[PDB]
């Protein structure tokens, strides 16, 4: 049972907020994590929001390309095998 990362990618562009509602949202995360995770990768230029199962994992990465794709924002994320 591997385990796979789900990072995302620093931009120029995508507001500070909508990541942190991503994180909160997607990730289940309280507004203190998410403020953390969001400044860690904005200065880091990536950073894990979770780690879970192949698929688990996988819904993650589709939720926040097709949600960044409606806030018109190009927010990047994808996963790794942990
Ligand atoms: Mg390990």
Do not use: W
């Amino acid at each position: 049972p591997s385990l796979y990362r789900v990072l995302i990618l620093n931009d120029d562009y995508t507001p500070m907020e909508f990541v942190v509602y991503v994180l909160e949202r997607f990730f289940n995360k309280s507004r203190e994590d998410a403020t953390r995770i969001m400044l860690h990768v904005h200065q880091n230029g990536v950073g894990v929001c979770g780690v879970y199962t192949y698929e688990v994992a996988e819904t993650k990465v589709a939720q926040v390309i097709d949600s960044a794709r409606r806030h018109q924002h190009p927010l990047q994320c994808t996963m790794e095998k942990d």
